[PDB]
Amino acid sequence: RSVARVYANVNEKLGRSWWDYDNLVVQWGVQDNYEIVRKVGRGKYSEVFESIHLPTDSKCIVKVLKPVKKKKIKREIKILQNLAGGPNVVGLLDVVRDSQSKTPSIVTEYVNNTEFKTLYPKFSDFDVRYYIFELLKALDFCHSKGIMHRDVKPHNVMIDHEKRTLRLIDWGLAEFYHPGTEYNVRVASRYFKGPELLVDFQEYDYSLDMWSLGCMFASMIFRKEPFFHGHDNADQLVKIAKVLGTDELYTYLERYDIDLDAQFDDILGRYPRKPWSRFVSSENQRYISSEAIDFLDKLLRYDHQERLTAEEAKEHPYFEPVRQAAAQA
Ligand SMILES: O=C(O)c1ccc2c(c1)nc(Nc1cccc(Cl)c1)c1ccncc12
């Protein structure tokens, strides 16, 4: 049915040794070369600890993984190996496991993040352009390697504001794109879920990540976190519909032959498109420009095939100051 409009054939060209994570053989490192110092975070899927690589006395992260499905371990490790050297992708340092339990751990680089709720309001207009551009380099890189992140959100984007460095982290939901594959629609955080996930459209692609980027960008320039605040998955679609409008939703549904679940009959009304300018306020207007609105408009589309590619997104006039400043060094 639907096929990605860029990078559709990447996994075809690279072959089984790139994407066949089921047959991954890990060359496990020495667990005793690492010392766990302090827990920094817990996920649904993991626990993250500040650690030391003892031989070099260097600071690093140990991410202990306990998913009920083992192939999710292999998938995360294969993608992290494949993205080696990628710009702004979190660096894999090692993979180790407990000798008795066989519980695996991923070792990554440590990043001194400032939490996004503190960090995002301190950004200038230029900072938003700059960090979105850096995030675009990581998404263009993984898409060009046949990989969808599927969990793009502020929590998975680590920024060292002092060093002006960015890392896209937590590749645990990431997956290889294979033309015509039916993917699980139970991916991403509710506020960052694309319409395709909300209406059970399974033939999605890299363009899912561009919707999620659009939700992050909206929250940064309008200072509303999260931008689409649904109380549940059905409500998430209503919140989107109350901004993009029900007219563009219905042609999209017709275009991809999607039938809405009967649950939407009572809760989904007819809404006109709310123009982007209505979200402009005294507090957020320092982020706002016609280039910014134009950029956001071209990310937040129902139709995944209408959204900018990460590569098109880097060519947008919004990033002209960032491209100019980079050209000065
Ligand atoms: O998943 C990864 O690849 C992943 C990779 C690197 C980090 C991480 C998650 N989580 C961090 N912190 C964090 C903060 C709150 C909750 C959770 Cl679970 C974790 C963190 C901190 C400093 N440097 C690197 C990381």
Residue in this structure with the two tokens 């909206």, named with its chain if needed: 218
Of 110, 139, 161, the residue that ends a domain is: 110
Structural domain count, the chain: 2
C-alpha span between 312 and 105 (Å, rounded): 36
Indicate whether 186 and 38 sit together in one domain.
no
Q: Show Cβ contacts of residue 304 under 8 Å, excluding neighbours closer than 6 positions.
A: 2, 194, 196, 204, 205, 207, 208, 210, 211
Q: Where are the alpha helices (DSSP H) in the chain?
A: 10-14, 16-19, 71-82, 116-122, 125-144, 195-198, 207-222, 233-244, 246-255, 264-267, 290-297, 310-314, 320-327
Calculate how far, in angstroms, residue 174's C-alpha sits from the geometric centre of ligand 1: 16
Indicate whether 37 and 152 sit together in one domain.
no
Left (φ > 0), alpha (ψ -120 to 50) or beta: where does 274 sit?
Answer: beta
Of 110, 145, 162, the residue that ends a domain is: 110
Indicate whether 204 and 284 sit together in one domain.
yes
C-alpha span between 167 and 108 (Å, rounded): 11
User: Can 205 be counted among the known catalytic residues?
Assistant: no
Return the amino acid letter for 199: V
48 lines ligand 1 (CB under 6 A): yes
Calculate how far, in angstroms, residue 203's C-alpha sits from the geometric centre of ligand 1: 30
Of 110, 140, 161, the residue that ends a domain is: 110
Indicate whether 127 and 101 sit together in one domain.
no
Calculate how far, in angstroms, residue 173's C-alpha sits from the geometric centre of ligand 1: 15
Nearest to 207 by CA among 124, 313, 48: 313
Return the CATH number at 239. Answer: 1.10.510.10
Indicate whether 31 and 73 sit together in one domain.
yes
Return the amino acid letter for 34: Y
- By most ligand atoms within 8 Å of CB, the mutation choice from 157, 158, 168, 171 for ligand 1 is 158
For 36, the domain range is 20-110
Burial class (CB in 10 A: 0-12, 13-18, 19+), 231: exposed
Resolution to 1 decimal place, in Å: 2.1
Indicate whether 79 and 199 sit together in one domain.
no
C-alpha span between 209 and 175 (Å, rounded): 12
Return the CATH number at 82. Answer: 3.30.200.20
Burial class (CB in 10 A: 0-12, 13-18, 19+), 17: exposed
